[PDB]
From a paper:
A well-characterized OGT glycosylation substrate is the TGFβ-activated kinase 1 (TAK1) binding protein 1 (TAB1), a pseudophosphatase involved in the TGFβ-mediated inflammatory signalling pathway and found to be an essential activator of TAK1. We have recently discovered that TAB1 is dynamically O-GlcNAcylated at Ser395 in the C-terminal domain. The O-GlcNAcylation sites on the OGT substrates TAB1, collapsin response mediator 2 protein (CRMP2) and casein kinase 2 (CK2) are located in disordered regions close to the C-terminus. The structure of the OGT in complex with the TAB1 C-terminal domain combined with mutagenesis studies reveals that OGT recognizes the TAB1 substrate, and by extension a group of glycosylation substrates with similar disordered regions, through extensive essential interactions with the TPR repeats. The TAB1 C-terminus binds in an extended conformation in the TPR domain, making extensive contacts with the concave surface through regularly spaced asparagines in OGT. In this work, we have shown, using crystallography and site-directed mutagenesis, that the OGT substrate TAB1 binds the enzyme in the same way as the proteolytic substrate HCF1 and that the five asparagine residues found on the concave surface of the TPR domain (Asn321, Asn322, Asn356, Asn390 and Asn424) are important for binding. Although the similarity to the HCF1 peptide binding mode and the presence of glycosylation on Ser395 suggests we have trapped a physiologically relevant TAB1:OGT complex, we further tested this model by structure-guided site-directed mutagenesis in the context of truncated OGT (312–1031) and TAB1 (7–409) as separate proteins. Two types of OGT mutants were generated: a single-point mutant in the active site (K842M), known to be essential for catalytic activity and a quintuple mutant where the five key asparagine residues that form the bulk of interactions in the TPR domain (Asn322, Asn325, Asn356, Asn390 and Asn424) were all mutated to alanines (from here on referred to as the 5N5A mutant).
Numbering used by the authors: 292 to 745, 763 to 1028
């Protein structure tokens, strides 16, 4: 039940062994193979390793070395056999164990990888590669402190160690340890430079590149190499180019589109587009959904399977070749890659080119940097032609924004709201005490004294009102008033967990209060619900500047992760900024997270990496978001969202403007009222949350794509 989010792919470090003082013929073969591996001639290396084995059957080094390459080629079962052989021959061969660990990890045997890694450490405490690998497991597991400790050990043992350093850098970012941030940024760029120069795979993951000050070429370059990793996996298959359909005849004139995701389940991707396959037009389209992950038991998974014309669990088709064949057999014209370099990706499928047109959509906010993807679906705001070079792909534009969300369908209970005038006579607030429900109006009919403000219903300091706040104060789950169920916002899982996760719409009327979260009733609340890694020192300062200008305001953030909080506080103090100025809350179930958005006055977006899903989440609550688009795609999503929404006023051209916009909202209350009103109104009226329309616009784009292809034309930008 842990929250899912976009995360990068796991990574491990392979160690190559040199054999000396051994058989000369063999040593040469093994050592030469090592050279080839460095150069990317995997096939050649494999042969040499085998030959070495033929010459010297009990060559431990050869076994391990061959195994690593095989692993690289996805031949995991085979690799394991060889690793074991190496160990039998040499029980204290630490390199073999560490390497074996990587394979198991790849097979998902975490407990197994751990044992292998630890054993290697036990054999050789001075083994740096092992320490790094151990660190990755901890990092993946969420034990960032250990990962940091382990990474430091590797670095201590081996100072020039890029994989460890970069991973360490990523770790620091997650918990916001900005110690020597400037230098760190400097070192990373340097490493990438050195690596790119040396035709080595960059230690900086493509997902991570967005957070560091790298040139666009470098980021694109980084992605490309990771693209290359895929070919090696598929070249072994030795498959021939597929034959692609040139007409829709076999398909009854219906365009065949397939969506490939490891995220059909409780993941942000589903939260955004679960509704779309269902909304496709049966007359002109056939929808195939290809799942890269097993059924998680979620309604999200259920809905997509039922709604799509065809659902295929490639989860059960581990062999990439077979899977691609399956897609081809399905006669797909457009295949959409929704993972990019994200956890669960099988870009190998895309490398094989099972379809005529392959497009990147929604899931990964970056370019594939790879040859196998023809287009990246975007919007003009998000991807201006000025920066097309930043992308390997051709740009296919969406009319307003490429982004979409399923909030309308998922959280209709937030369409309307009501409040309690607690103070009560002086001042009526829209965000101190809030009520949301399917049955709200019905409930309101029962209360004669409610006052309508326009618009918004306000409940006075009633006997009823008294009871509700009492429930909140006492921590009760829910209460019944005139037969209606009024429930504590903090207790939704207790009442119904499907409700808490967004699996189902909540039945009861929910009370959300500032008191629940320790927020002030007398001040402006500025918020950000993103993962802490999206924050850099620069952003905090900007936020600090803003806070300094609004006297009793506060910043609301999440323990995402929790170890991050102390760091943020200290840094803030250095800048401003008493501790009371920043308030942290724990991560919450999806519904509550979206709902508590109503409590905030304004949301301050993160410039380095914008909130994407998070941006939609905030908007649905009718809370204005201030943003400053940057060069990267990931830095421009929020602006695109706002533009679609209709609030150009919230987009900032520079830091001064951003601070200014925020400050005005904080200080000019009528303006705040006005802007909030716009957002509340527009989320509905705008096309931002309109799934049917979005799907329609999308269908439009595909056909443009298809016609172009049918015309015998290679991909080119689509700016209609
Ligand atoms: O208290 C919270 C805060 C966030 N989220 C969700 O956590 C995920 C965060 O994902 P990611 O960090 O990938 O967000 P994005 O980059 O798309 O904004 C999203 O589904 C948010 O709705 C949540 O469920 N509860
Ligand atoms: C906050 C958080 O943990 N984000 C994770 C990171 O730890 C991990 O390395 C990777 C998935 O394997 O990216 C994502
Ligand atoms: C490139 C890749 O697949 N990396 C791995 C993944 O296979 C594994 O299941 C996970 C477990 O921590 O770590 C990551
Ligand atoms: C996380 O996932 C959503 C949906 O796939 C995607 O739109 C978003 O860009 C991802 N976030 C990041 C930071 O990659």
């Amino acid at each position: 039940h842990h929250v899912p989010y976009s995360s990068a792919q796991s990574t491990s470090k392979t160690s190559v062994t040199l054999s000396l003082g051994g058989g000369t013929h063999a040593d040469s073969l093994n050592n030469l193979a090592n050279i080839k591996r460095e150069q990317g001639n995997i096939e050649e290396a494999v042969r040499l390793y085998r030959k070495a084995l033929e010459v010297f059957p009990e060559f431990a080094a050869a076994h391990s070395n061959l195994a690593s390459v095989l692993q690289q080629q996805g031949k995991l079962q085979e690799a394991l056999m060889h690793y074991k052989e190496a160990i039998r021959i040499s029980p204290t061969f630490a390199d073999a164990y560490s390497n074996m660990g990587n394979t198991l990890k790849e097979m998902q045997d975490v407990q197994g990888a751990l044992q292998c890694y630890t054993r290697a450490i036990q054999i050789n405490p001075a083994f740096a590669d092992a320490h790094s690998n151990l660190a990755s497991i901890h990092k993946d597991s969420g034990n960032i402190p250990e990962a940091i400790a382990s990474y430091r050990t590797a670095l201590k043992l081996k100072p020039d160690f890029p994989d460890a350093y970069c991973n360490l850098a990523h770790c620091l970012q997650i918990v916001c340890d900005w110690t020597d941030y400037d230098e760190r940024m400097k070192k990373l760029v340097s490493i990438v430079a050195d690596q790119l120069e040396k035709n080595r795979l960059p230690s900086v993951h493509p997902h991570h590149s967005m957070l560091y000050p790298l040139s666009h070429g470098f980021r694109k370059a980084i992605a490309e190499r990771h693209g290359n990793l895929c070919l090696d996996k598929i070249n072994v298959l030795h498959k021939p180019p597929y034959e692609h359909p040139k007409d829709l005849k076999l398909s009854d004139g219906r365009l065949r589109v397939g969506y490939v995701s490891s995220d059909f389940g409780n993941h942000p991707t589903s939260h955004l587009m679960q509704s779309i396959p269902g909304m496709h037009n049966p007359d002109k389209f056939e929808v195939f959904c290809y799942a890269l992950s097993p059924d998680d038991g979620t309604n999200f998974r259920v809905k997509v399977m039922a709604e799509a014309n065809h659902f295929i669990d490639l989860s059960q088709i581990p062999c990439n070749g077979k899977a691609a064949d399956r897609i081809h057999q399905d006669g797909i014209h457009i295949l959409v890659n929704m993972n990019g370099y994200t956890k669960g990706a099988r870009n190998e499928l895309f490398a094989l080119r099972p379809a005529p047109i392959q497009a990147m959509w929604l899931g990964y906010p970056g370019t594939s940097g790879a040859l196998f993807m023809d287009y990246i679906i975007t919007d003009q705001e998000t991807s201006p032609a000025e920066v097309a070079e930043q992308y390997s792909e051709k740009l296919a534009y969406m009319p307003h924004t490429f982004f979409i969300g399923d909030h309308a369908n998922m959280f209709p209970h937030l369409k309307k709201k009501a409040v309690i005038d607690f103070k009560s006579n002086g001042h009526i607030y829209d965000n101190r005490i809030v009520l949301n429900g399917i049955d709200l109006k019905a409930f309101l009919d029962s209360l004669p004294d409610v006052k309508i403000v326009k618009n918004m219903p306000v409940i006075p300091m009633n006997t009823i009102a008294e009871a509700v706040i009492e429930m909140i104060n006492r921590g009760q789950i829910q209460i019944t008033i005139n037969g209606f169920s009024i429930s504590n916002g903090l207790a939704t899982t207790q009442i119904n967990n499907k409700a808490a996760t967004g699996e189902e719409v909540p039945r009861t009327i929910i009370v959300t209060t500032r008191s629940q979260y320790g927020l002030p009733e007398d001040a402006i609340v500025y918020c950000n619900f993103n993962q802490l890694y999206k924050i850099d020192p620069s952003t905090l300062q900007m936020w600090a500047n803003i806070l300094k200008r609004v006297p009793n305001s506060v910043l609301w953030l999440l323990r995402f992760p929790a170890v991050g909080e102390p760091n943020i506080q200290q840094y803030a103090q250095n800048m401003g900024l008493p501790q009371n100025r920043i308030i942290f809350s724990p991560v919450a179930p999806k519904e509550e997270h979206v709902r508590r958005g109503q409590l905030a006055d304004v949301c301050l977006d993160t410039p380095l990496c914008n909130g994407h899903t998070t941006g939609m989440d905030v908007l649905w609550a009718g809370t204005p978001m201030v943003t400053m688009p940057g060069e990267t795609l990931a830095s421009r999503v929020a602006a695109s969202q706002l533009t679609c929404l209709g609030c150009l006023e919230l987009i900032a051209k520079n830091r001064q403007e951003y601070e200014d916009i925020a400050v005005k909202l904080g200080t000019d209350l009528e303006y705040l009222k006005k802007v909030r009103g716009k957002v509340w109104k527009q989320r509905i009226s705008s096309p931002l949350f309109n799934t049917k329309q979005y799907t329609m616009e999308l269908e439009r784009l595909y056909l443009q794509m298809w016609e172009h292809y049918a015309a015998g034309n290679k991909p080119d930008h689509m700016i209609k």
